Paper text:
Then we were able to determine the structure of a small narrow region of the assembly to 3.5 Å resolution from which we were able to build an atomic model. We generated a ∼ 3.5 Å resolution structure of the narrow region of the assembly which resulted in us being able to reliably model the side chains within this region. It should be noted that the molecular weight of the interpretable portion of the narrow region structure was less than 30 kDa. An interesting structural feature we identified in this model is the interweaving of hydroxyproline residues at the interface of peptide B from one PPII trimer and peptide C from another PPII trimer which evokes the “knobs-in-holes” interfaces of α-helical coiled-coils. Such an interaction could not exist in a canonical triple-helical configuration with a right-handed superhelical twist. Further examination of the model revealed that the lumen in the narrow region was dominated by rings of hydrophobic amino acids. Cross sections of the structure revealed that there were three sets of hydrophobic residues, forming rings with identical residues due to the C6 symmetry at isoleucine 7, methionine 10, and leucine 13 of peptide C. The diameter across the cavity formed by the hydrophobic rings was ∼5–6 Å. We are fairly confident in the side chain positioning of Arg16 as that is well-defined in the high-resolution narrow region model.
Residue numbers in the entry:
A (entry chain H), B (entry chain G), C (entry chain A), D (entry chain F), E (entry chain D), F (entry chain E): 7 to 19
G (entry chain L), H (entry chain M), I (entry chain K), J (entry chain B), K (entry chain J), L (entry chain I): 6 to 18
M (entry chain Q), N (entry chain R), O (entry chain P), P (entry chain C), Q (entry chain O), R (entry chain N): 6 to 19
Write the structure that this text describes.
Amino acid sequence: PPAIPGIPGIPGT
Amino acid sequence: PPAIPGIPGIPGT
Amino acid sequence: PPAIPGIPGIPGT
Amino acid sequence: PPAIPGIPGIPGT
Amino acid sequence: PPAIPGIPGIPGT
Amino acid sequence: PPAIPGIPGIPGT
Amino acid sequence: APDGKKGEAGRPG
Amino acid sequence: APDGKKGEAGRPG
Amino acid sequence: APDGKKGEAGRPG
Amino acid sequence: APDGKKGEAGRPG
Amino acid sequence: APDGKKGEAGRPG
Amino acid sequence: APDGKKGEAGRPG
Amino acid sequence: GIPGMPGLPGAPGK
Amino acid sequence: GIPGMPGLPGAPGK
Amino acid sequence: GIPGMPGLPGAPGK
Amino acid sequence: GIPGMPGLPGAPGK
Amino acid sequence: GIPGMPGLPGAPGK
Amino acid sequence: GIPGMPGLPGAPGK
């Protein structure tokens, strides 16, 4: 089970 | 079927 | 034992 | 035929 | 001997 | 002969 | 085939 | 399967 | 051979 | 297992 | 051996 | 073992 | 099976 | 077993 | 068959 | 043996 | 044969 | 033999 990368965060309101 | 990376978003108008 | 990437730092207060 | 990465864009005038 | 990545630089004082 | 990555550019004076 | 996330565009102002 | 860290959203102002 | 996307240049002002 | 470096937090002001 | 592109330096002002 | 380049620190002002 | 990377979000205008 | 990458944090508003 | 990465977009002027 | 990547430093406040 | 990555461009002065 | 990545340069002060 090779690993999955994480999601980048958004700019704030 | 190895995976494909995602496209980066654009600067806003 | 393949290696693990490091965590990115946060913006300051 | 393994794939080739894309070129990053430049800052505008 | 597979290669090691380099360290990112810091913001200046 | 596996490939070598390129060097990032510097901030201008 | 775990594929990547697509980025958001910037906001206007 | 060592999985990656998810990023933080930006702050308001 | 799934190849990458090329980036956009910045806008003038 | 050569592991990566952890990033610094930003400074206040 | 497809090698990477080198980045541009920033401009003065 | 082709190893990576280390980044520069920022300048003061 | 190797997985893929995700993209970055653009910057806001002015 | 290959490991994954982590994400970036967003930018603050104005 | 390994796939490739995409590029970043430049910053706007002033 | 594959090696890992390092992280980025945060941005300063205002 | 694995290919390489490209670099980023620097930021302008002030 | 796999090669390594390079680092980024920091941002200037104010």
